[PDB]
Design a protein. Sequence first.
Lengths: 142, 254, 195
Amino acid sequence: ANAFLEELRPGSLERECKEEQCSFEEAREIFKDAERTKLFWISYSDGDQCASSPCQNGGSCKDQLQSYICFCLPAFEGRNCETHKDDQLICVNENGGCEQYCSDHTGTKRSCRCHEGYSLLADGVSCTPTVEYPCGKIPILE
Amino acid sequence: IVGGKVCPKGECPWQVLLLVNGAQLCGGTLINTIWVVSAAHCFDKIKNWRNLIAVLGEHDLSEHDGDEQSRRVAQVIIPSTYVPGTTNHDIALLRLHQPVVLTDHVVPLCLPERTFSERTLAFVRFSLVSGWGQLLDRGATALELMVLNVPRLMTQDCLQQSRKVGDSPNITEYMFCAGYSDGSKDSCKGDSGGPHATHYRGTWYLTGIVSWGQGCATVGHFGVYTRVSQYIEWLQKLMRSEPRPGVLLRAPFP
Amino acid sequence: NTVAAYNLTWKSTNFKTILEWEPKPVNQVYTVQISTKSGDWKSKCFYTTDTECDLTDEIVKDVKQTYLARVFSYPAGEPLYENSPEFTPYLETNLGQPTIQSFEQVGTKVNVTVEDERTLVRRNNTFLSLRDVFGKDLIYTLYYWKSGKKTAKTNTNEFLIDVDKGENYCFSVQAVIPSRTVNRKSTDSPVECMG
Ligand SMILES: C[C@@H](CCc1ccccc1)Nc1c(F)c(Oc2cccc(C(=N)N)c2)nc(Oc2ccccc2C(=O)O)c1F
Ligand SMILES: C[As](C)(=O)[O-]
Ligand SMILES: [Ca+2]
Ligand SMILES: [Ca+2]
Ligand SMILES: [Ca+2]
Ligand SMILES: [Ca+2]
Ligand SMILES: [Ca+2]
Ligand SMILES: [Ca+2]
Ligand SMILES: [Ca+2]
Ligand SMILES: [Ca+2]
């Protein structure tokens, strides 16, 4: 920034650009050379994208050049940590976690079922054979 | 099978061997103790209808190790929409006259329900294909059961990566492609009707019936299989129906 | 009816990989699938109205693997779909802009340090740094002026250059993966000068 009698003093990157906010001329007045001022400026002007605080649900944000990078906690994902993995429990997702049959539900949680000759365990997703020779099993290997 | 391996005795327990007048006909898939799924095209020029035998527990065509069981087939049901000599709706359902006995070498493949197959089993890449068919185009048949693992394909891809043969029959919504385009591996004549089983979370399901292809393992052509998922309820409705007299039955589809 | 998606682009930096595509949904929704050349297809972004999908958690399970993805279009009232180009994380993911951690003056020699910017690759909940992922494949390049433009190279995160005990030098670094022929160099960091 420029004050009454400050520009009588030679430029300073801390004082003028880090301490105070400088302009392009002021920076050029320091680095002197066009390209040197360019190189500094391309980074000095292409702001902190993390300022809008774009990473939701706990993710951390690393600013970039006209962009940023979000690092999300384990249960989230997406460009801004919007997706909750805990909410993706639908049959079109890993067969809804069901070992065999998965029935999708609107307001209710997905419900697993099984094939004849098997029974749903207590965990609500596994199926155990109810008969000696259940269908999709190779006896010699099982 | 072209480019497969001999399935070890007992590890392809749902494989059935269809015989007519004593001769080797087609493969099949045990779905429970009384029913087996096969291809409609195996019956196109069959005259001896009461001379149809289904053999299970079979592995080596050159020996009887007492593990094999055979039953005569009481009924073969094909969709009324199927047109002999053609490609579409190539599925058949056989009612075994007497129920076989599930043993270590005789176990049925699970017939899944339409949505599980459509949205889940449809996405596991590789599935097994087996039978006692030709070991290569016009080549000899196999004596020991042969298996092959083939990667499934969406029809758009199958169409995008195949040599445009102006006479090739269209791949309909009743079938899917699978295998390789480099002429290395594939099902083959003699395997028709046999199973295409997909493994999922510890259990095997029936996803396809070996149906057709442009010659076995041709460059720029995949083998096509019957999309069993489209026939689940049709298969179910029929397995609940009383035995309509006569061996052949052209049931309405659906 | 629907319209197949198009211009599927992979966008990746420090392993944060996101698939983008067109067009903007108009009476249709999309579903994406990912897989390695010969693995089962995994669905992500179910019935999304967005034209992008975060595939990071999938690609970072093996950054050296090659993945193909597809985008399905469903009518909003086999479906249409388009395959994406292939993407091998390790060779194509962009190296973000580096950041000078410090520049200590040791006698006549000055030591400049580049901080290891974190990648999205995880290990025991932790995020590995660019150096834990690329290792010896990562070369950092220093630029420094006093009118002049000198450079230096290091296969670690630190540089030691001879400064003329008489002036305030300036810096700026670049991350470079020599083995590459695609995205082998990153954008130059922010200029840092000695006050
Ligand atoms: C269905 C109908 C449509 C007409 C048609 C036939 C071929 C191509 C397009 C249309 N026509 C047929 C096939 F498609 C067929 O398919 C394959 C079978 C197994 C493997 C195949 C492969 N993957 N190459 C292809 N095999 C056929 O005949 C056999 C002949 C000799 C010995 C065994 C046979 C048998 O098994 O029925 C047949 F009549
Ligand atoms: C699937 As095709 C056309 O190659 O036979
Ligand atoms: Ca000033
Ligand atoms: Ca100034
Ligand atoms: Ca000032
Ligand atoms: Ca100030
Ligand atoms: Ca000036
Ligand atoms: Ca000024
Ligand atoms: Ca920025
Ligand atoms: Ca035998």
